[PDB]
Design a protein around this ligand. Structure first.
Ligand SMILES: [Pt+2]
Lengths: 91, 146
């Protein structure tokens, strides 16, 4: 006998903020605080991470939560008219 | 997306999220809530699912993985996940296209399966329940696994 396709629990995902030249530094610090509950002197250090490396992991959530967060961040960036890009990363 | 019975479940799901100050209203809170929704509970009992085990599994998972608000913040009480919005739209679209005008907990239960990548869909499969099983119970008769 058998039992349909596989299972495997959903994977956790990394939420990432990509760097760009048009988004002002202050706005990214703002996003890190508003959507990641980051300490002022932690978000600020994390913005430096994004600028320096060109990309930085802002957190790790379930696939479900990560997807919602990415969408909240990008919608916000868009409404403020900044090309701030937030992305999803498996593992 | 209304059924009184279903609306109650949705109310309980949100009240629970807000109680633990959860930042998000998950498909897992939804299924957790549906466990006491007669329509849903019924289809799951017909599928010989251990509700006690499922309930424990769901509660453990949402406490360990759901982000908690800063206790301060504005109030912005619980943001439904995109997955959550999708299962509801799916259940609503199915009912509307069937010519009926009532969305039951069981319809919602069915829509959850299409959310691959949700812990909820994973836990249902783990308990040997498939979309087809719920669909067979909903229609025809009590086509039960038992
Ligand atoms: Pt309640």
């Amino acid at each position: 006998e058998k039992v349909r396709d596989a299972l495997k629990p959903p994977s956790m995902y990394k939420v990432i903020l990509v760097n760009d030249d048009y988004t002002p530094m202050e706005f990214v610090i703002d996003v890190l605080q508003k959507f990641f509950s980051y300490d002022v002197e932690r978000a600020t250090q994390l913005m430096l991470a994004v600028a320096y490396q060109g990309k930085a992991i802002c957190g790790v959530f379930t696939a479900e939560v990560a997807e919602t967060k990415v969408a909240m961040v990008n919608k916000y960036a868009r409404e403020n008219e900044h090309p701030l890009l937030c992305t999803l990363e498996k593992a | 997306m209304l059924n009184q019975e279903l609306e109650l479940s949705l109310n309980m799901a949100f009240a629970r999220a807000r109680e633990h100050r959860h930042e998000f209203m998950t498909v897992e809170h939804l299924l957790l809530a549906l466990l006491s929704n007669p329509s849903a509970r019924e289809a799951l009992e017909a599928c010989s699912v251990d509700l006690v085990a499922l309930r424990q599994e769901l509660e453990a998972f949402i406490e360990q993985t759901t982000p908690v608000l800063p206790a301060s913040e504005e109030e912005r009480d619980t943001q439904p996940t995109l997955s959550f919005q999708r299962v509801l739209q799916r259940a609503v679209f199915h009912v509307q296209s069937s010519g009926r005008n009532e969305v039951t907990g069981a319809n919602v239960l069915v829509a959850i399966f299409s959310e691959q990548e949700s812990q909820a869909a994973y836990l249902l499969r783990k308990h040997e329940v498939s979309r087809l099983d719920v669909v067979n119970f909903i229609s025809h008769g009590t086509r039960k696994d038992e």
